[PDB]
Amino acid sequence: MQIFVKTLTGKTITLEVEPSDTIENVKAKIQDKEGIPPDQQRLIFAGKQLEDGRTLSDYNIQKESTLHLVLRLRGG
Amino acid sequence: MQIFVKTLTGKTITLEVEPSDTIENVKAKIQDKEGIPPDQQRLIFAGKQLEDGRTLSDYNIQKESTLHLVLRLRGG
Amino acid sequence: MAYQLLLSKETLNKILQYKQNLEKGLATPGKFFLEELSKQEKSISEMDITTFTQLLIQSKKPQVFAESQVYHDGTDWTLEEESILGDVSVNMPVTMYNDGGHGSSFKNHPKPISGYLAYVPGALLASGSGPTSDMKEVLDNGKLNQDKLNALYERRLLPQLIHFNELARQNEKQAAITIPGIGTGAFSGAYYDVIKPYVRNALIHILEKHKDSLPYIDIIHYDPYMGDEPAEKKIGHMSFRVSPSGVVRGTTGQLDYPLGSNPDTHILVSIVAWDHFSWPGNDYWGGARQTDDGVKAASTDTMGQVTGATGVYDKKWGRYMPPESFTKDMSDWGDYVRENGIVFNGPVLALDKSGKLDTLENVAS
Amino acid sequence: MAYQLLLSKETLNKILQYKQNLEKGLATPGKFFLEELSKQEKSISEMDITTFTQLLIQSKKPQVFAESQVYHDGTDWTLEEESILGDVSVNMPVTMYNDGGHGSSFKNHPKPISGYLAYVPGALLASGSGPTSDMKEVLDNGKLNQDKLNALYERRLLPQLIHFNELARQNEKQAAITIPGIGTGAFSGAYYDVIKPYVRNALIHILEKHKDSLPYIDIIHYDPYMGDEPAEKKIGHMSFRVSPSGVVRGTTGQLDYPLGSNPDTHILVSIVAWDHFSWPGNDYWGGARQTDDGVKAASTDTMGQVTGATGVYDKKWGRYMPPESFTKDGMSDWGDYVRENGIVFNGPVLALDKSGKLDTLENVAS
Lengths: 76, 76, 365, 366
What we know:
heterotetramer; A: alpha+beta; Ubiquitin-like (UB roll); 1 helix; globular; C: alpha/beta; two-stranded antiparallel sheet; about 30% helix; about 20% strand; Macrodomain effector MavL domain-containing protein (chain C)
């Protein structure tokens, strides 16, 4: 299964994924393709924020969904 | 007058501007601060597409408004 | 009104299936479809299919960014609504005021041109959320398929080709049609840098499959900004020209007669890259003379033909600005349609299996 | 429902000004405030000031991204409304189920702690489109004014500080407070990598100005992630500690008794970085244990105290899941519960007056 990621360069990339891939594995693939380390990434799907630990299957992310990638800070 | 630009990187930069500065001037300053040439820039403010030739005051952009930077690309 | 909407036979099958699904309680309308239905006195079963497609087309908002702002679930438009809306094209006669150049490269026509625009929504391969109906139609495990894309663009373009063939036939002329890089912009999404030859091949396929069905379409001037080699090609009787405005400078504008055509021998027709959910103007309803849609809608009297109001052409900005009665009191055309309650609804026809445009109920039999 | 909304004397002045402007049509409400205003049947001129303020609070939404999806005009909330909402804090007694570790670094508490939370909205210096109220208040020609930020955080924090002083006083104990980097997150916007010392100095100034008004606030455990030096300070009887958990190993959690404190001698209260427009812990109303707000709302029974419902804590994920009665049917988050049950955010509102005593709004107004 292939999904899309709207990246931090204003572009859109593709990733080969499996619904059993965890969000941190998706972040590792996004680091593979773009370089941003996974600890600085926040994945958003249609408003819902994706957390490391649960897979794409748990969020019911579809055939060719598109995840927004946002820069991640720590604080409040 | 200083305004903000939510850039591609996801962060937000500050920008020295005047109400009489055209959108082209804003794009040149964004190029100086982030590298993106003006021909690749699309400026949005509150959903309104800012276009070259118009000044910042032509869009009623006040003291500390924030401009979205989007990657401009050619086609249809 | 001054515009007309054409849809394909398979689009009418889509509409028939969606209507008989909504009648059986098997599906549920989207939000905007429901808002437009609420103003209607009739139910889904009372109205004919023409009123159904009219209320579905009326759901389009004047200004929409389909590449991000659409959820494709129930929040705005269900996927069936999207698969129907993408195949609907709208044509209208226009007064072309400048050559249609982007930015500040436009050149004002000294005597404005009389021609025709045909807004056809390109393939939507971009979204801010879930997959689009076009994504499911033309993509096979994320790989672009040229055959399905050919079928899509044929479905969406052939009705306008038939209409303008008949128009040139009735005008004792032939048809010179300018086509841009439809769907090669934001609509391409991740396929931004592979889509150009796919669109060119889809166009060549449509032309060569129906060369004899279009006897009076003579010149076809196709111009993606870049990404393609300049070329001429013979397709039966018609000359198909790939002339990238960015590669070969001096190319005729989108709202300008191609080389070898003139108002005495050809009618000028321009295909405009539309979207699934906006009015013919899109960006220019928000005031922006940007993108193919916006530049063409702003450089012509599109907003006049859609709203019925008489606007003024600003030569300095190359714009069809709203009427003085409104502007004298930054107020764009979307402001006009909001303040005057103007909607987008017009006559609709379908392309028969034989190849003749007719009313929806007629061809549905 | 067992939460309590607090606001400063200046906030009450703003509220009275806004109400008097609405009575005589000088100002117009916003879409969400007017929408929560139409669900009742008293006009601006009949109801007292607590009910007006409570409807203004009820204009909040369970999850809102105040730095992105807010317009700061009639579309949602106008500017007087945002100025008032930012100054409003809330507090509640909570059951702390883990030390508040972010992501998956949390350690579950074998015996959950009986403590309290104080959600306080930080300085909002970020917006998707338009200038915010705190932007106009604390920025002087683009620079961060330390004194204006000091006055802001004073207005916002001092009612909670006085309330928890009284709470410790009524329990024969002192108060150990843990504070995170309030405005250091996305709220900092363009000032992201300069604001940490400003926030620390604002906390220090608030403590200095009212050290004698706070007899029983003993330990204050301030904890940004990084970007601050580990230090210890004597503010009168108060032990103010800067121990950033990102640079110091073994730092006590935010939902953890700081060093030199225990349930016998202290009551544990944690300040939570809030926003102007959302219910406490908005990121967890969407189901995410991410921002400080969300982590602290998920690791405690905050959702249970705001909705009045009985959730269940989940150890593997460290989250306060919605009632099993409701989640019996996908991943139905707490926002789904409040949406289907139609719960509203509205509680008792008190104000801090001239003498540092919390009273009703009408009493403080005169």
